[PDB]
Amino acid sequence: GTVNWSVEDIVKGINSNNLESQLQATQAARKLLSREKQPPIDNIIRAGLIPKFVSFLGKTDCSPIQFESAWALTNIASGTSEQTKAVVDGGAIPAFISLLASPHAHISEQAVWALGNIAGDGSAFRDLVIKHGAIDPLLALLAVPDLSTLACGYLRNLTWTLSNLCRNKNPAPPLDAVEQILPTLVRLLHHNDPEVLADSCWAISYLTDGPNERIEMVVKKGVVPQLVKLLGATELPIVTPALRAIGNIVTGTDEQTQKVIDAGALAVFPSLLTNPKTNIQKEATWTMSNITAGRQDQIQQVVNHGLVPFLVGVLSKADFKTQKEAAWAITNYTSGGTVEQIVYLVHCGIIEPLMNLLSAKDTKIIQVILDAISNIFQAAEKLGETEKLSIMIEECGGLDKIEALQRHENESVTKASLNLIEKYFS
Amino acid sequence: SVKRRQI
Amino acid sequence: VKRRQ
């Protein structure tokens, strides 16, 4: 019936002055735009069909053509920024917001989807959707005593669209918009559907990706324990954003970092720091690096939880980007830790994997490692045991690495090179 | 991307 | 010395 229409036939039916002919042509456009391989979005745009689709959104007496045109516009808006802009330029934003209150749930859901694609394009369209007033009717769709009574796909779509309203910086979303959305986000973060949980965590990860004032808005909602619980989920689509959110929070103040430790997050990191998925291991080590940049009592928690052997592990063997994060964790540890804590680090075997990474070509990781070596020597000075550390470094080939590094191309590495040899290797 | 096409 | 994402 409406399968495999040409764009020319779609235009002919939509321009026909016959509502039923228009409906059949709009459904044909929807099916074209819903095929798997290369939907002809630009062809549909170039035919000038977007204004007619937008006008069809307002035909209350023919809900099928509202649905079909909403679906068609949703899939155009799913494309490039240009293609999303064409949908916005046709006036679709207020028309879709009007459809959020439709009595037909499948039309309301289509409008939710369309607004998620538009807001998802970037901060400008995100903020434009907010200025048109989308947040109030979106949140009203979730104003039920128990989310479990909502259709599963309906709830997943609303969660995803709400997360796109929280997404992107330069600029971050308006503060009042974030405050209005957060209580619903907290409710969705306690729902029992894995996809809702994943997109709820992504939303929280967006809101915590910013300055400490943005992190505080989230932490003050009391969500850190739930985030730590989701840190231990079996589903990788949940662990990934949960870890991102936790890692974002520990870039804030020592007090915000303490909430993460208080909630029991460190107990999950034996698993995370050995996780077979490279990205989880990398972001878990990044998170560890920002915790070891904290107070000495927070470094002590890392010690108590047995996590220093795991840092030695990732330093000894991991993806290089993970090893670079491990080097940062070590340098931050040695920069803020006590003499005892630094001594414990050497006793766990940090020296040899540290020296082995001095063969890397990433100039920054060499600077990071050389800083850590200096910090450990400074602790060994307070104990008078610098000669013991010098023996450790030369016995594992580290001296040969530093003594060949004074001729490096970067100069802050050559200065750090020679300074270590003049003081401790002569 | 964070956009979704409905199939 | 925190490092952002």
Author numbering:
A (entry chain A): 72 to 497
B (entry chain B): 297 to 303
C (entry chain C): 298 to 302
Q: What did the paper state?
A:
Impα is an adaptor protein that links the cargo protein to a carrier protein (importin-β; Impβ) that, through transient interactions between Impβ and NPC proteins, translocates the Impα/Impβ/cargo protein complex to the cell nucleus. These sequences bind to Impα through hydrophobic and polar contacts with two binding sites, known as major and minor binding sites. NIT-2 NLS (915TISSKRQRRHSKS927) and PAC-3 NLS (281FDARKRQFDDLNDFFGSVKRRQIN304) peptides, corresponding to regions of N. crassa NIT-2 and PAC-3 transcription factors, were cocrystallized with N-terminally truncated M. musculus Impα lacking residues 1–69, variant α2 (MmImpα, UniProtKB: P52293).
The crystal structure of MmImpα/PAC-3 NLS presented two fragments of PAC-3 NLS peptide bound to major and minor sites. Electron density is present for seven peptide residues (297SVKRRQI303) at the major NLS-binding site, bound at positions P0-P6 of MmImpα. Electron density is present for five peptide residues (298AKRRA302) at the minor NLS-binding site, bound at the positions P0′-P4′ of the MmImpα. The KRR residues were modeled at the positions P1′-P3′ and Ala residues were modeled at positions P0′ and P4′ due to the lack of electron densities for their side chains. The presence of electron density for only three side chains in the minor NLS-binding site with higher B-factors compared to the entire protein indicates low affinity of this region to the protein or peptide staggering. Taking into account ITC assays with PAC-3 NLS and the previous structural studies with Impα, we suggest that peptide staggering is occurring with N-terminal sequence of the peptide (281FDARKRQF288). As both mutated NLS peptides were not able to bind to the protein, it is possible to conclude that both clusters are necessary for the interaction between PAC-3 and MmImpα, thus PAC-3 is a bipartite NLS, as previously suggested in the study with PAC-3 and NcImpα52.
